[PDB]
Amino acid sequence: AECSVDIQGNDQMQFNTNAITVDKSCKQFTVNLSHPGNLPKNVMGHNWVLSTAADMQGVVTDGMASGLDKDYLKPDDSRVIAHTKLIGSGEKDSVTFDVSKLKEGEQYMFFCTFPFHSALMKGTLTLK
Numbered sequence: 001a002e003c004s005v006d007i008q009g010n011d012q013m014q015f016n017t018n019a020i021t022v023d024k025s026c027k028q029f030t031v032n033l034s035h036p037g038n039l040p041k042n043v044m045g046h047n048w049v050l051s052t053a054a055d056m057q058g059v060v061t062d063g064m065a066s067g068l069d070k071d072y073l074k075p076d077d078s079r080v081i082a083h084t085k086l087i088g089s090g091e092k093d094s095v096t097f098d099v100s101k102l103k104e105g106e107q108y109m110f111f112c113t114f115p116f117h118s119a120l121m122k123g124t125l126t127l128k
């Protein structure tokens with residue numbers, strides 16, 4: 001089975017997908033994030049941040065208050081399972097995390113923590 005996925009966020013606060021599936025036989029999983037847009041990082045920045053469905057609101061709120069200098073993530077936030085860096089127009093970044101960090105039956109969300117982007121840019125990640 002495949003153990004990677006390519007996601008894109010555009011100049012319209014859309015994610016290329018809203019549902020990620022991780023196969024149970026994968027030992028590592030990789031997200032390749034891309035920005036095929038024109039607005040820069042300080043205007044239309046996007047990251048890919050993974051957490052449980054319960055920790056989402058806390059990560060986004062504390063992320064907003066963290067500022068652009070911290071890629072809109074509160075430092076030493078234990079709720080972030082895995083994440084990419086905040087990117088701007090024509091930029092790319094990938095993250096690889098251990099599938100052992102995921103539990104079957106638990107429900108996870110991936111989102112962008114750029115202020116107010118999480119309302120449009122959200123999605124589910126399930127371990128299958």
Ligand SMILES: [Cu+2]
Pocket residue numbers: 009044045046047112113114117121
């Ligand atoms: Cu964003």
Ligand SMILES: [Cu+2]
Pocket residue numbers: 083
């Ligand atoms: Cu980190």
